Design a protein around this ligand. Structure first.
Ligand SMILES: Nc1nc2c(ncn2[C@@H]2O[C@H](COP(=O)(O)OP(=O)(O)CP(=O)(O)O)[C@@H](O)[C@H]2O)c(=O)[nH]1
Ligand SMILES: [Mg+2]
Lengths: 178, 24
């Protein structure tokens, strides 16, 4: 069976684990349990042939900066993730995640993924940001960041509602296999 | 086209126990 290795990175609290678990199991995690290192496996049929997805969940915490690259060798595609309702997490795409991944994996495709899409239209979330003169990250703004960091694709999704979720992994697959 | 995923397995779990200072 063809196999694809996909590694997911990005700031603490952005939704990396929920993204992977909602996609692979259709169940959205009830708890917020920060990750150290987890690997999941799932199969998909791609144009009539099965592909094994090896999905590598990593820690957003800076504590794990020396450990994290244990995941990187032989990666086929990265998902760099930020929350659409956390401008700090968005900035770190450029400041931290892109340069980290590229150092270890000079040629590996990167998808930029904006998470928590359901909160961009959430009134309380909008107000919480508006109180501080901020707004959610917009699709054109995310795309501009994707271009700046040389992502092969920019995608937005909600692990919670599953809107855009399948497409994130579809595009990750196509980024590797065509 | 690409199908929905199947056959979920949680293959590796690494924890950290802050009291013992060790990975679980
Ligand atoms: N509204 C909403 N909340 C989400 C979504 N995805 C994750 N969350 C929430 O964000 C929090 C963090 O989710 P989690 O998936 O653990 O984030 P992570 O990036 O894996 C955290 P770490 O890097 O420490 O492992 C949780 O409270 C979770 O419920 C989403 O699509 N929508
Ligand atoms: Mg996690």
């Amino acid at each position: 069976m063809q196999a694809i290795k996909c590694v997911v990175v990005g700031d603490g609290a952005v939704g990396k684990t929920c993204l992977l678990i909602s996609y692979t199991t259709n169940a959205f995690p009830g708890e917020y349990i920060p990750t150290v290192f987890d690997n999941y496996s799932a199969n998909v049929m791609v144009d009539g042939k099965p592909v094994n997805l090896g999905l590598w969940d990593t820690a957003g915490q800076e504590d794990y900066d020396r450990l994290r690259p244990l995941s990187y060798p032989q990666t086929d595609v990265f998902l760099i993730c930020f929350s659409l309702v956390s401008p700090a997490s968005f900035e770190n795409v450029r400041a931290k995640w892109y340069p980290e991944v590229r150092h270890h994996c000079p040629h590996t495709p990167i998808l930029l993924v904006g998470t928590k899409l359901d909160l961009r239209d959430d009134k309380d979330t909008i107000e919480r940001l508006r109180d501080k003169k901020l707004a959610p990250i917009t699709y054109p703004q995310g795309l501009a960041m994707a271009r700046e960091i040389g992502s092969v694709k920019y995608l937005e999704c909600s692990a919670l509602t599953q809107r855009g979720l399948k497409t994130v992994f579809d595009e990750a697959i196509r980024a590797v296999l065509g | 086209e690409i199908s929905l995923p199947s056959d979920f397995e949680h293959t590796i779990h690494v924890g950290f126990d802050a009291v013992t200072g060790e990975f679980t």
